[PDB]
Amino acid sequence: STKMQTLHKLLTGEVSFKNKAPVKDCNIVHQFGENWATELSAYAKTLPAEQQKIIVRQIARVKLTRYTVAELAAYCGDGPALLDETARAANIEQGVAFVKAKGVEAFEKYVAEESTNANWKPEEAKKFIEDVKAKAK
Amino acid sequence: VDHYNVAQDVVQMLTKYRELQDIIAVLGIDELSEEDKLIVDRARKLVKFLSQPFQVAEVFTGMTGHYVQLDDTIDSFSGLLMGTYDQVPEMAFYMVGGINSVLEKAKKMAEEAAELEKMRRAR
Amino acid sequence: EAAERNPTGDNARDRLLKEVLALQARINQR
Amino acid sequence: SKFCAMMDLLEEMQHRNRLKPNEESWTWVMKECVKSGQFRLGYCIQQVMETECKGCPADLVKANEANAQKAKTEGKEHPGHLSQQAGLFDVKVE
Amino acid sequence: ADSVGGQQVQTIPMIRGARFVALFNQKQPSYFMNAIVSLYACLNGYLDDVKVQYVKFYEYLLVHRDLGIMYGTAKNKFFYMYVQELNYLIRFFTLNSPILHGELEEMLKQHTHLFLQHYQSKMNAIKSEKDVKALKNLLYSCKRAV
Amino acid sequence: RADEVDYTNLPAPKPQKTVWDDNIETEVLRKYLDGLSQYDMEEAKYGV
Amino acid sequence: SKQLTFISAGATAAVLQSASAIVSKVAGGRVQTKTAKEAGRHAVVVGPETPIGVHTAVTEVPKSAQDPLFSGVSTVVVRAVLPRAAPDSVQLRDALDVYASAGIDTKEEVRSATEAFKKSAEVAVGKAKAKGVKRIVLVVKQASKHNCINELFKKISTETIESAGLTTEVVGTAAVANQLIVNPESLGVVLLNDVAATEQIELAFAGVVGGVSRVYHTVEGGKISAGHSFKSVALAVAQELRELGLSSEADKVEAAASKNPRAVVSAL
Amino acid sequence: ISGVSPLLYFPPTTTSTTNREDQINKNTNIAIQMIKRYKGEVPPHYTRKSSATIEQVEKEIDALLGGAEKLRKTSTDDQPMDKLTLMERCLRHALWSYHKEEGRYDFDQIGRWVVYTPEDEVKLAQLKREVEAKEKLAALRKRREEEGLPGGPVPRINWPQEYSSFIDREPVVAKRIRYDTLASTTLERDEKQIES
């Protein structure tokens, strides 16, 4: 109960972090956990409609904030709904350019290292590399 | 760092004055050299400045209490150590707060002394 | 020559010190 | 540091056991200095070998000189902050 | 013991003892090489013209940094302060040995000459309200650093 | 059932001062590189 | 007859061609569309890069184009823009901070920066008074490098706002961006110092709002539209046509932007 | 670095076709403008009362001093000087000051005929270190360009370690972008135009 209450207060902005750090998806995952969104969604059902709507809005805004300011400015210009697809397209274009510039094996190794550092799943990395290769040819 | 250095210098000066008290009581203040004389005077001023009346001591003392700030204390002690207040009368630091109060008391003492000397000369 | 050519609490404390020193000098003169 | 370990061993042998090091030990030390690239320690060991043993190996001396010249050419003759100029009030004493 | 109530006469033993006393002050443990080098310098009199209140700054400059390289007056080959591995060589061979004696003496002479020429002159010339405070802070920082 | 979790506490991200190689270029541009390192540390402590 | 001045500042040829096609199709040829690099009125600037001659960089949350996530939010984000010289020449925002360290005189630069900051503060306080808010939020990057430009901006902005009669709260960049993106309803009027970080934050805010057209106030006196994406450029064109005096065309362009942001030209 | 990032980091590579020549031209323009502002105004033009060349003056001085070589006598530094020695010192000082201002840095002769103060000696040492450092840096950058490595300096950083240490990804991304841009860019200026 205390975890859900603290998460709701933090999302509402009533209570800030100890160091007044920005309320970001990364920090929320670090503190509460990976399934914070799901657990909060389950908990909110025991709250009036207004509180549930506020929880949903805050969760969506946090998911949007998960991106960086530069990425949001570059890709979110046409809307948050299209932001994800724009970011994916930009990343795929960058991968295609890297492949064309520095072969294929080097790109594979670089993508592997990038996924390792970024905590991307092996399946997601394989999907991305296959997609960029298909786009190239 | 300023606080630390000021504290260390104050402790060293007080220790030196304590050591020199014995020589003073045996040979007299005149026997000591000029450097020792300056150290003695500064140490006495520091000792009298360390005194501080308390707001709950009105009945015991009969004077208003004083609240002093850390920065004010450090600055005043640094100045006294450097010698910026050598000409100030020794007693002005007794039962007072900050350097501002010290200077005000010194001004009051000087005015009273001038008035008393004028009256004496008139007599 | 080149250096010459190129170009409040502390003030209150300095003023008070000057006033006290002046008072001491005046009483000495008296 | 292999050099430090070997010097400590030599001190233990000579002082706490009364055993004079032989030329083989000094040659090993000079080889280690050359391999590490410590040309100054190589010079010092060369002087020590000349003083006590019957000279320093020419191959090791030449290797040390080559390493020193390479460092000089590349610009690593001495540290950088030492070359940096600092005034009386500029020294950033930590 | 006799100098309690009388003017002192600056003899070599008194000067060296005062410098040793100033050196003994320290907060953190000192590496054997730096310690022995400083003690040897004070014993042999490279500090006799150095001021007691500035011995700590002198030692800081001699140990943490260097002046021969900075002023382009380097002449030694292997005896340099930044080579911390010379400690075991010093342990093996006494400083009073032909192997290191000359280099050590040359380095000490160079450092002392540079310090007296440049830093101590400025220190003595300091005349201001802020420069004096900065010098005091620097001296204390060196004292509790080395 | 106690000692569960703090929630509102985030450990401070320990910044690491960028280190440059020892070279003549490094000596020439010491001031600029040091300023870049200081800016990096300030950005790390301020978030962005 | 009438002329619309299209300016490109870091914009893509695709977006520029889309804007040209949209304006041509909507207007029908009554108002010509000429391309230039500087203007004071009837001007639309496409691209993240700030154009030349703009001192105020205001943006708001239009009611019509409110995103469902950010429905009902009302905050005015105004960025102060210093005068822009040629790209090769050193910009004022950097000169004012580097010449101070170098010892070079910075009197004319300081005066120009003061004029720009005063104009930006006047616009911000006017917006705050119009909205009825009592306190505005100043945004300054806490970078040690920008220890002079930010100081001057804070001094001038707070002086002007206190003279006007409103309150000022100073903040950095990361925290203010996070607040504006998570809980923007807690901020009424936010002024930003002239920095690339502030520009990027403003662009990100405009994008996350759902696509909006920013307003730039130039030294010549006036308002010019600014966009960076297809939807933002479409909204800018609609606002420009509305200013020219075309209401039906502006409404059609707004509807096309709301419906099909990436292909408004084909949608309408 | 808790939390899966939306995207994987890639080299920005925004300097696809930004020629080092254009970058150097921009740097030269910036330096020219800054130096002009620092200097203020070019000092007013001066008309020579007499026309002569530095080489001609040096030749004349050498010829003049060659006739008195036998007369010239060495002496201790602290002892009083002779007329020949004084003329030699004054003329050489002026000539070498002119040469050093022009750009001919013969430190061997400068330290002899121009250094008379410890301040002068310190300035000479600093100038010599600066000149040697610039020459070595130019040679090293030439070798780097020949090797094909990026002209700009690069720090010694373990980006995987930085990723592991950092929680948020935005500062790390910004740092990587800045350092990659620095590596791609070349910090060189048209010394010809600067000297002109």
**How many CB atoms within 10 Å of residue E143?**
20
The answer for G165, left when phi > 0, alpha when psi is -120 to 50, beta otherwise, is: left
Shortest CA gap E116–chain D (Å): 12
Chains that touch H (3 or more CB pairs under 8 A): A, D, E, F, G
Per-residue H/E/C for chain B:
CHHHHHHHHHHHHHHHHHHHHHHHHHHCHHHCCHHHHHHHHHHHHHHHHHCCCCCCCHHHHCCCCCCCCHHHHHHHHHHHHHCCCCCCCHHHHCCCCCHHHHHHHHHHHHHHHHHHHHHHHHC
Query: Residue for token digits 């991305």?
Result: A128
Domain ranges of chain A: 1-67, 68-137
Radius of gyration of chain F (CA): 18
- CB-CB under 8 Å, C20 with B100: no
**Do the two chains D and A touch, given a threshold of 8 Å on CB pairs and at least 3 pairs?**
no
Radius of gyration of chain G (CA): 19
Name the CA dihedral angle for B56, B62, B68, B72, rounded to a multiple of 10 degrees: -170
Contact G158, G168 (CB under 8 A): yes
- Angle (nearest 5°) at CA G178 between G174 and G181: 140
Name the CA dihedral angle for A3, A5, A7, A10, rounded to a multiple of 10 degrees: -140
Chains that touch B (3 or more CB pairs under 8 A): C, E
* Among G214, G185, G209, residue whose Cα is nearest residue G79: G214
- CB-CB under 8 Å, B31 with E137: no
- Dihedral of alpha carbons G210, G211, G212, G216, sign: positive
- CB-CB under 8 Å, F39 with G142: no
Contact F21, H156 (CB under 8 A): yes
Coil, helix or strand at residue D92: coil
Judging by DSSP bridges, how do beta strands G54-59 and G76-80 pair with one another? antiparallel
- Residue A104 in contact with partner chain G when CB distance is under 8 A: no
Which residues are G8's β-sheet partners? G46
Shortest CA gap A68–chain G (Å): 9
Q: CA-to-CA distance for B23 and B36, rounded, in angstroms?
A: 11
Contact G112, G70 (CB under 8 A): no
Residue B57 burial (10 A CB sphere; 0-12, 13-18, 19+) = middle
Name the CA dihedral angle for G89, G92, G93, G95, rounded to a multiple of 10 degrees: 70
Query: Residue for token digits 């009592």?
Result: G134
Residue C17 burial (10 A CB sphere; 0-12, 13-18, 19+) = buried
* Among A70, F2, G240, B93, residue whose Cα is nearest residue H9: A70
**Which positions in chain E touch H129 (Cβ < 8 Å)?**
72
For every residue of chain G, DSSP letters joined together read: --EEEEEESS--HHHHHHHHHHHHHHHTTSSEEEEES--SSSEEEESSS--SSEEEEEE---STT--STTTT---EEEEE------SSSPPHHHHHHHHHHHT---HHHHHHHHHHHHHHHHHHHHHHHHHT-SEEEEE----STTSSHHHHHHHHHHHHHHHHT-EEEEE-SHHHHHHHHH-GGG-SEEEE-S-HHHHHHHHHHHHHTTS--EEEEETTS-EEEEESSHHHHHHHHHHHHHHHT-HHHHHHHHHHHHH-GGGHHHH-
Annotated binding residue E26: yes
Shortest CA gap A124–chain G (Å): 26
Q: CA-to-CA distance for H145 and H23, rounded, in angstroms?
A: 15
Instruction: Pick from E88, E90, E121 the residue to mutate for testing the D interface (most D CBs within 10 Å).
Output: E88
Which H helix or E strand runs over H72? none
Q: CA-to-CA distance for F16 and F41, rounded, in angstroms?
A: 7
Q: CA-to-CA distance for B1 and B7, rounded, in angstroms?
A: 10
Judging by DSSP bridges, how do beta strands G43-46 and G54-59 pair with one another? unpaired
Coil, helix or strand at residue D64: helix
Contact B49, B80 (CB under 8 A): yes
Q: CA-to-CA distance for E49 and E124, rounded, in angstroms?
A: 13
Contact A6, A39 (CB under 8 A): no
Judging by DSSP bridges, how do beta strands G135-139 and G76-80 pair with one another? unpaired
- CB-CB under 8 Å, A68 with H8: no
- Note the resolution in Å, 1 decimal: 3.7
Q: CA-to-CA distance for B43 and B13, rounded, in angstroms?
A: 6
Q: CA-to-CA distance for G154 and G173, rounded, in angstroms?
A: 14
**C-alpha distances in Å from residue G23, one per residue of A38, G9, G257, H8, H181:** 46, 19, 13, 38, 37
Query: Residue for token digits 């620095």?
Result: H182
What residues of chain D, 53 to 92, have a C-beta less than 8 Å from chain H? 75, 83, 85
The token duo for D71 is 């460092």
DSSP state for residue H80 in the 8-state scheme: P
The answer for G222, left when phi > 0, alpha when psi is -120 to 50, beta otherwise, is: left
Q: CA-to-CA distance for G113 and G115, rounded, in angstroms?
A: 5
Distance, first Cα to last Cα, chain C: 44
Query: Residue for token digits 């990976």?
Result: A34
**Which positions in chain F touch A19 (Cβ < 8 Å)?**
10, 12
Spatial neighbors of G202 by CB under 8 A, at least 6 apart, are G57, G59, G77, G79, G192, G214
**Do the two chains F and E touch, given a threshold of 8 Å on CB pairs and at least 3 pairs?**
no
**Which positions in chain F touch H156 (Cβ < 8 Å)?**
19-21
- Residue A6 in contact with partner chain F when CB distance is under 8 A: yes
The token duo for G193 is 């110092």
**Which positions in chain G touch F48 (Cβ < 8 Å)?**
173-174, 177, 197
Coil, helix or strand at residue F20: strand
Q: CA-to-CA distance for C19 and C22, rounded, in angstroms?
A: 5
Q: CA-to-CA distance for A18 and G8, rounded, in angstroms?
A: 45
**C-alpha distances in Å from residue G231, one per residue of B31, G4, G11, G45, H34:** 93, 18, 14, 14, 41
Which residues are E114's β-sheet partners? none
Shortest CA gap D2–chain E (Å): 11
What residues of chain G, 179 to 238, have a C-beta less than 8 Å from chain F? 197
Q: CA-to-CA distance for F32 and H151, rounded, in angstroms?
A: 16
Give the amino acid at E79: F
Coil, helix or strand at residue A11: helix
Q: CA-to-CA distance for B122 and B115, rounded, in angstroms?
A: 11
Q: CA-to-CA distance for A32 and A4, rounded, in angstroms?
A: 9
How many CB pairs (< 8 A) connect D and F? 11
